[PDB]
Amino acid sequence: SDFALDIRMPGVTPKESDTYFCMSMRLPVDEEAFVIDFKPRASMDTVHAMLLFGCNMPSSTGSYWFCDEGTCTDKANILYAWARNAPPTRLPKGVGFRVGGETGSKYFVLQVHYGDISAFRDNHKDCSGVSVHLTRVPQPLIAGMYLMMSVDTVIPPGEKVVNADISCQYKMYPMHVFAYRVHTHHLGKVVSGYRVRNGQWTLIGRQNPQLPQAFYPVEHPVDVTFGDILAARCVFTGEGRTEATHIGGTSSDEMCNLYIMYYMEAKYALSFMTCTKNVAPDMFRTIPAEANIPIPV
Ligand SMILES: [Cu+2]
C-alpha cells in the first residue's frame, strides 16, 4: 500500500556561500496519496536549511536549478522544512498531507540552502535531501501548513532586544493545530506563536530557535477558527553586530518564521496559508511575559 520517495540532490557542489539549489520529483502515481513522515538526509555543517514543496509546475526542467529561478510557477505549498539537525518528523495517526488525485500536487520541489563554502574546499558532491513516506490509504485528517513570516524586521547594531511581531486575522474553515517549527538565524533568542481569541492568548508553541528546528508537538492542541488572530513574536538581539541586520537570504541576514502544522476535515481542507503581516500591532501590549523570557537552551 505505501511507498517511499528519496528526494536527493544529484551530487551537487556549490561554488559560493548561501547557494540555493532546487530540484523536482514527480509523484509516481496520479491517484491520491498521503505524506505521513519526513526523514532528512542533511547536516548543519554543510546545509543551512531544506524546504519541501508540493506543486504542479516546477520552475525548471533540469536535474536541478538555482532557486532564484523559482520553486514552482504555480502555488508552492510547504510540506516540510528542516534546519539544525532536526530529527525525522512523523505525523499523528490518521493525518497526512494530501497529494495527487484530482486536487493534489503532482510534483515535489526540494530547495536546499547550502551554508558556508568552507564545507566544499573538499569539492565533494552533495546528495542531501528528504525521504518521504506516502500511503494510498485515505487519511480522514488532511494536514496543511500555516507559515508566519516577517518581511520588515530591522535589528539595529548592538540593541539588547528587538521584537518582531506577526499577526493575521484567521478567516477560514476550522484548522486544528498539532505541531510547530520556529526559525531564526544567529540573533534569535526565543520564538513564540499564539491563538488570540477575544483578548485571551493561547500558546501554540514557544521554542529556542538555536535548538534543532524540529516540528515539536503542540503541548495542548487547539482549534483555530473564524475570528481568531494568530500571533507570533521572535525576540532578537543586535549584540555582536557592527551594522543593522535586515531580513534576508543569507546566513548573516535574519529571518523570523513560525511554521504551524495543522489538520482539517478532508472535505474542506486547505494546504498552505501565509501571514507576512502585522495587522494588530497594539494587540501585543498583552502578549504573555513568557514570550520575552529566553528558553535557556
Ligand atoms: Cu534561514
Author numbering: 60 to 356
What text appears in the publication on this structure?
Two enzymes, peptidylglycine α-hydroxylating monooxygenase (PHM; EC 1.14.17.3) and peptidyl-α-hydroxyglycine α-amidating lyase (PAL; EC 4.3.2.5) working sequentially are the only proteins known to catalyze this reaction. PHM, a two Cu enzyme, catalyzes the stereospecific hydroxylation of the glycine Cα of peptidylglycine substrates. The two copper atoms in PHM, CuH, and CuM (located in the N- and C-subdomains, respectively), each use a single reducing equivalent from ascorbate to catalyze the reduction of molecular oxygen for the hydroxylation of the Cα of glycine at the carboxy-terminus of the peptide substrate. Crystallographic data on apo wild-type PHM and on several crystal forms of three CuH mutants (H107A, H108A, and H172A) presented here show that the copper ions are required not only for the catalytic steps but also for substrate binding and for locking the overall conformation of PHM in a configuration that is catalytically active.
